[PDB]
Design a protein around this ligand. Structure first.
Ligand SMILES: [K+]
Ligand SMILES: [K+]
Lengths: 260, 79, 96, 192, 153
RNA sequence: GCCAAGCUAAUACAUGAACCAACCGGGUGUUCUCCACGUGAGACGCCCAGCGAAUGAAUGACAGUAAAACCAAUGCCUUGCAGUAACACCCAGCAGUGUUGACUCAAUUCAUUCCGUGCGAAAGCCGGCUUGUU
């Protein structure tokens, strides 16, 4: 296998300049794909800025300070992908990873006891030894005894502290979903209708709060609430609405002028 | 002959003063006996718990079927 | 409270109806019914005796089998009304 | 060494492929088992991924199953009588999958008497020794089951035809099933 | 007593080995009725996804095919293509033509192009030259075959 | 680049943990208690019933009809069919229900089998306090 990851071949969401490093932290295998993850060294050094170098990044991680899903991690190459609760008790950061409207990773700060509430999408339903229904999720976790009504495509809200599922949200029309793939990713919208093409990818037509009609493949949506009004957990600050680029340009120019 | 202290009999050698006594391997002190006994305990306890989740899950399946069966029997009662 | 007593493990092929009358002997029995689960329903004339019957028959062994007795919520009067309700709708069915 | 790639093959157009790469271990092949009848000799093969393949060299016994009765017994292999590939594999007594063999029919006779109380011949099982409760079980089974004469005559003779269902050069064992129905009648004509 | 075994089939058994399906046992005195056709024979016949109907000759036929998508372990996946039967001179195999137009960007014009595919055809279909078939991608069945016939039009 | 002889360890190599510790089914007994004089019932003895792998058998669903007789067996009410999950108990719902677009797949039960080419609680190490044959 390969162990190196070149700077250019690294994902663009990590925001590492092509002039500083020739190589990048190659994410060792784990819960998330290396294309869809921020290495815990990248998180601790380039995002939280607690570490100045990579040598000062291994200092933090090996100490066991950084907790992921109520579990300390010591490897800087740990994936630590999307919808995971990261906690550093020394500073009490207690934030989760989300996708903003522009599709990038967001350190959404969480309240107290909101860290226990965590979601994960069911990707496969199978029986283990002894006729035991098992559900594996996007995090790679295997649920030994899920809800009898749980199906593939639904997300279970899972208590990290208790290590037990607490509720199920079925994938149907009229639910709140957040897209996880492509340029459409990071947008919270409402499932209006899903078109089912057997064999090929499934197309999910969505409509966000502002009324924009957008679509994507059904493998990218992630149910986040029963309805668009009420969501189980906190979302990034944009509220999942992508506004017009021309109006995006006008407002920031006005705000920059308001400083002067 | 067993049931004695072994650390009083091994060979010490003097260099030129310190005496060189080897580390005693396979010496199962009662601290070592504690974890070995603990090892066989959580194993049987952890498979006892697994039968509880299997038992409770079978309660979930059967209780719902019992509910649906008498519901069909209540509808036919009116008929 | 209720006069009915639930008795097990009386097996119908193993034990005849006369022998199952033998442990019921000494306490008045309203009616006896026998079932496949090896559990029998024996209506008792005296509700007071039924409360005494479970204490008298607690831990007892009948026909070489440890016996379990419990008072049953079902009563004779609710069944006989159901019985008469059965015949009238039975006679209607025969007429169809 | 032996390779399983398509580089040496001609294109469908008939042209010659110009190979610009040396042989790879991921496309290798091995020499066949040529498993024969005899005392059990096997050779492990370190396959890819660390798993071990059991290259059987000689075999004499295996589990042979009566499909119509869902029953299987360990029997010794007496002979190989048919091979759909060539006569040279029969003549050399080479055990391969789907080859027709003759096995010992004694365990299937003992089981049939123990199960149905019908001794085909009529240490050895005695039907009359069974307690009188058992004949009630036999009567219930005898109405459920009816055996074929062609198979029963094979039990009487002592040898029963069978078909190997395992791959001796891959799993290291020679298991099979007894020939029943039209399959048996197909092979009886060839053997006759 | 003695069971009346099913007679051998002269019109199917011609391969010097007994032709049989490796999914069901046809030698049972009592079948399971799960895999039984309307003629009283034991037959395995699955259904493939993507809304393809299993032909009647596959459900109630006498043929044996280890590469047929309906009555064997050959599963259809990947690409579902469409073409015209070009040649039926092999055994259980046909050649199809995928005729298309290729656009040359410099000259702003198209040109007629064709592609040939070797496709396994089950005995349930029996197509003819010039007909129209729907094919589905399967595992390598031979040196050239990677598709199986799903319809005949 | 190399031999021969003396010790000596390991988480190197090998062997091996009965009780504590269940549910579960199949084959049986010329075995004992019973009912009328066999789809009879109950206890007990022994032979298997772990993960994985090999062979075979069953599951791994139906989804283009409405009423009566008849006979054998088994449920019930009471001494003829209205009601009714399944079940001859110690469990009166401890599964009649995996998945995929589709599986000869997952998983379960039954029968035979594993011979070096598998499986320990490494028979392992380190730390803390209240320093504990839990
Ligand atoms: K697919
Ligand atoms: K082949």
């Amino acid at each position: 296998a390969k162990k190196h990851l070149k700077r250019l071949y690294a994902p663009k969401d990590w925001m590492l300049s092509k002039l500083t490093g020739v190589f990048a932290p190659r994410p060792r295998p784990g819960p998330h794909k290396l294309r869809e993850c921020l290495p815990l060294l990248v998180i601790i050094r380039n995002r939280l800025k607690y570490a100045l170098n990579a040598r000062e990044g291994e200092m933090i991680l090996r100490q066991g300070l950084v907790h992921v899903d109520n579990h300390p991690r010591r490897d800087g190459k740990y994936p630590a992908g999307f919808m995971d609760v990261v906690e550093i008790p020394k500073t009490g950061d207690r934030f989760r990873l989300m996708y903003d409207v522009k599709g990038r990773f967001a350190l959404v700060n969480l309240s107290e006891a909101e860290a226990q509430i965590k979601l994960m999408k069911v990707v496969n339903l199978y029986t283990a030894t002894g006729r035991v229904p098992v559900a594996v999720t996007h995090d790679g976790h295997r649920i030994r005894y899920p809800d009898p009504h749980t199906s593939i495509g639904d997300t279970i809200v899972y208590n990290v502290k208790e290590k037990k599922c607490v509720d199920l949200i079925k994938n149907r029309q009229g639910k709140a979903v957040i897209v996880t793939g492509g340029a459409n990713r990071g947008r919270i919208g409402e499932i209006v209708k899903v078109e089912c093409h057997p064999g090929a990818f499934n197309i999910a037509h969505l409509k966000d709060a502002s009324g924009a009609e957008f679509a994507t493949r059904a493998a990218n949506i992630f149910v986040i609430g029963k309805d668009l009004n009420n969501l189980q957990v906190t979302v990034p600050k944009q509220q999942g609405l992508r506004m017009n680029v021309i109006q995006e340009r006008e407002e920031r120019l006005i705000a920059a002028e308001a400083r002067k | 002959s067993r049931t004695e202290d072994v650390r009083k009999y091994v060979v010490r050698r003097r260099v030129v003063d310190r005496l060189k006594a080897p580390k005693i391997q396979r010496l199962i002190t009662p601290r070592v006996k504690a974890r070995r006994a603990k090892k066989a305990k959580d194993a049987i306890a952890k498979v006892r718990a697994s039968a509880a989740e299997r038992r409770e899950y079978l309660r979930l399946i059967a209780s719902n079927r019992r509910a649906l069966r008498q519901r069909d029997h209540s509808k036919k009662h009116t008929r | 409270n209720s006069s009915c007593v639930f008795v097990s493990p009386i097996f119908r092929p193993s034990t005849t109806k006369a022998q199952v009358m033998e442990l019921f002997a000494g306490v008045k029995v309203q009616r006896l019914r026998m079932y496949r689960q090896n559990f029998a329903y024996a209506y008792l004339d005296s509700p007071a005796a039924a409360k005494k019957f479970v204490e008298e028959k607690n831990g007892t062994e009948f026909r070489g089998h440890t016996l379990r007795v419990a008072l049953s919520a079902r009563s004779l009067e609710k069944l006989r009304a159901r019985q008469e309700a059965a015949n009238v709708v039975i006679a209607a069915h025969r007429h169809y | 060494g032996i390779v399983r790639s398509r580089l040496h093959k001609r294109k469908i157009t008939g042209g010659k492929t110009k190979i610009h790469r040396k042989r790879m271990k991921a496309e290798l092949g091995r020499l066949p088992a040529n498993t024969r009848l005899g005392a059990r000799r096997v050779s492990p093969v370190r396959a890819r991924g660390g798993n071990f393949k059991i290259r059987a060299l000689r075999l004499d016994t295996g589990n042979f199953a009566w499909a119509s009765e869902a029953i299987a017994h360990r029997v010794r292999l007496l002979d190989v009588v048919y091979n759909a590939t060539s006569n040279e594999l029969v003549r050399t007594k080479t055990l391969v999958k789907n080859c027709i063999v003759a096995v010992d029919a004694a365990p299937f006779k003992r089981w049939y008497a123990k199960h149905y109380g019908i001794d085909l011949d009529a240490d050895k099982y005695d039907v009359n020794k069974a307690s009188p409760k058992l004949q009630r079980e036999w009567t219930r089974r005898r109405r459920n089951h009816r055996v074929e004469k062609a198979i029963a005559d094979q039990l009487r003779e002592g040898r029963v035809l069978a078909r190997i269902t395992s791959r001796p050069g891959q799993s290291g064992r020679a298991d099979g099933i007894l020939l029943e129905g039209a399959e048996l009648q197909f092979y009886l004509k060839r053997l006759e | 007593q003695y069971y009346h075994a099913h007679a051998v089939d002269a019109t199917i058994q011609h391969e010097k080995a007994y032709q049989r399906q490796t999914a069901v046992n046809e030698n049972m005195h009592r079948p399971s009725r799960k895999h039984v056709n309307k003629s009283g024979h034991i037959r395995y016949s699955k259904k493939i996804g993507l809304g393809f109907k299993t032909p009647a000759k596959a459900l109630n036929g006498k043929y044996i095919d280890r590469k047929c998508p309906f009555t064997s372990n050959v599963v259809i996946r990947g690409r579902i293509l469409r073409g015209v039967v070009h040649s039926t001179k092999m055994h259980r195999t046909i050649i199809i033509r995928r005729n298309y137009l290729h656009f040359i960007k410099k000259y702003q014009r198209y040109q007629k192009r064709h592609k040939s595919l070797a496709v396994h055809c089950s005995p349930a279909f029996d197509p003819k030259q010039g007909d129209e078939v729907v094919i589905g991608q399967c595992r390598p069945l031979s040196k050239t075959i990677r598709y199986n016939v799903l319809e005949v039009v």
